[PDB]
């Protein structure tokens, strides 16, 4: 008969490549269009939120979470698939690093540990890997700014500008269309708004659009003063009221 | 300028080279038409 839809849990794919990954990438393609732009002085990520019912509160859905103050993340796919992954991903960064080195996890170690959970889901039978794709953007002292595309197959690669979701193929050219590596962060946000606007024309406001940036530390989000050594959070989530300010200036 | 063009691909590069000559109202295919024919047929066969 046809294939049994194996992750290589108990069975290797006879076709030479796993067929359900493309069906898991179909669940990735099922997700909203989410993009990111890696520049020299900062990294910006943009994504759209599903409206669903008109009475659903838009502030409840957060498609950009906080792992470490210097590293942001954005995802496209099923809702509960991202929560179970990150709830376990946080405990990995705490025990394997923060309970040992007692600092904030860098960009190289944190992204690698997130992909290891997907590797265990593919290896351990009976547990289906989650079909969400995560775009992790962060800034550390060692490697600096970084933008990585985490695939459900367990592979990650750096990208200057990349997109996931239904517009993964379409917006990838659109990001390369208006943006180049020589551009800075300020001109990158305007490009991210123009590219994400082409995804849906219904509502471009901050209610259904969640925009976040990575950049210079903000002392207002540090929560304390008096210590010059400890750096402030490099990730600042843009309020929906502030998102409309960038729309009028777009 | 091309890569691995078989007998079927060479005929199209020559056919497309004559296509620009019709827009030029010329009975001859200019050398500039070949430069646009290579960058076209190679990208034309790659699509789909």
């Amino acid at each position: 008969m046809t294939d049994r839809y194996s992750f290589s849990l108990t069975t290797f794919s006879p076709s030479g490549k796993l067929g359900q990954i493309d069906y898991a990438l179909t669940a990735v393609k099922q997700g909203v269009t989410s993009l990111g732009i890696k520049a020299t002085n900062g990294v910006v990520i943009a994504t759209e939120k599903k409206s669903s019912s008109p009475l659903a509160m838009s502030e409840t859905l957060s498609k950009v979470s906080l792992l470490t103050p210097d590293i942001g993340a954005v995802y496209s796919g099923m809702g509960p698939d991202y929560r179970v992954l990150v709830d376990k991903s946080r405990k990995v960064a705490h025990t394997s690093y923060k309970r040992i080195y007692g600092e904030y996890p860098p960009t190289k170690l944190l992204v690698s540990e997130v992909a290891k959970i997907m590797q265990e889901a593919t290896q351990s039978g009976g547990v289906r890997p989650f079909g969400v794709s995560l775009l992790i953007a962060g800034h550390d002292e060692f490697n600096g700014f970084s933008l990585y595309q985490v695939d459900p197959s367990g592979s990650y690669f750096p990208w200057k500008a990349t997109a996931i979701g239904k517009g993964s193929v379409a917006a990838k050219t659109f990001l390369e269309k208006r943006w180049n590596d020589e551009l800075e962060l300020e001109d990158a946000i305007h490009i991210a708004l123009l590219t994400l606007k082409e995804s849906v024309e219904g509502e471009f406001n901050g209610d259904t659009i969640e925009l976040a940036i990575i950049g210079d530390e903000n002392p207002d989000l540090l929560g304390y003063t008096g210590i010059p050594t400890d750096k402030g959070p490099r990730f600042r989530k843009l309020t929906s009221q502030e998102i409309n300010d960038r729309l009028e200036a777009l | 300028k091309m890569n691995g063009c078989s007998g079927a691909d060479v005929k199209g590069v020559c056919t497309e080279a004559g296509m620009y000559a019709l827009r030029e109202r010329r009975i001859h295919v200019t050398q500039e038409d070949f430069e646009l024919a290579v960058g076209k047929v190679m990208n034309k066969n790659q699509e789909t």
Binding site: Y23, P54, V84, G126 | -
Partner: protein, 241 residues
């Protein structure tokens, strides 16, 4: 087919097991309404009236998790009672380890991630019931979190469950645009029950009696369900307006 019996991904990305989860929620044909007031939250569930051989007091679609917190479930009964036992266990354990009340935002998140744990188990069947959590938060105030059997929860201005949910959402959407607020007036919690039932009858198009409905009320630091005499008292006050 074998592809329809598996919990894992389908060829088209549409899970057949999840489609039966939402399909089983409409098997009982129960229409419930959950709205948010100003200082209070009132949720009313449709109470099916069986013959005289069943106790209507024992029959309930709303379970009490804790004070100020309440849950209404529409779907398969055997998965409805077991889902309430899991929400109560996590509510008491969270008030011990962390020593703080468990909000419906987290209370809908625990059952949502727990449903994904059931999908990872081959012998265990996931919950096919809808979990609607309502309470009055100390900060955010009234909040509604409705957990789909697939583990989807998001805040709502007004929500319902049933085949008429599309008609209920449309009727309540235009009403919220006139006042430009998602909260019901008459801050007194006694009058909030009047409007919550009034907007439900106009949305459903059918008037119900005291035995046809079960009115839950979640107040500040208190939660209770109106009995047959209290629901009948509400219908008398609603009839005069």
């Amino acid at each position: 087919g074998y592809d329809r019996h598996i919990t894992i991904f389908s060829p088209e990305g549409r899970l057949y097991q999840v489609e039966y989860a939402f399909k089983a929620t409409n098997q009982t044909n129960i229409n419930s309404l959950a709205v948010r007031g100003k200082d209070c939250t009132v949720v009313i569930s449709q109470k099916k009236v069986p013959d005289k051989l069943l106790d209507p007091t024992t029959v309930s679609y709303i379970f009490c998790i804790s004070r100020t917190i309440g849950m209404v479930v529409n779907g398969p009964i055997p998965d409805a009672r077991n889902a309430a036992l899991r929400a109560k266990a996590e509510a008491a354990e969270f008030r011990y380890k962390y020593g703080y009340d468990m909000p419906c935002d987290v209370l809908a998140k625990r059952m949502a991630n727990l449903s994904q744990i059931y999908t990872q188990r081959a012998y265990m069947r996931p919950l096919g019931v809808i979990l609607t959590f309502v309470s009055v938060d100390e900060e955010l105030g009234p909040s509604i979190y409705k957990t789909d059997p697939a583990g989807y929860y998001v805040g709502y201005k007004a929500t319902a469950t049933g085949p008429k949910q599309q008609e209920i959402t449309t009727n309540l959407e235009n009403h919220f645009k006139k006042s430009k607020i998602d909260h019901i007036n008459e801050e007194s919690w006694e009058k909030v029950v009047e409007f919550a039932i009034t907007h439900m009858i106009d949305a459903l198009g059918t008037e119900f009696s005291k035995n046809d409905l079960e009115v839950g009320v979640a107040t500040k630091d208190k939660f209770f369900t109106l009995s047959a005499e209290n629901i009948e008292e509400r219908l008398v006050a609603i009839a005069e307006q």
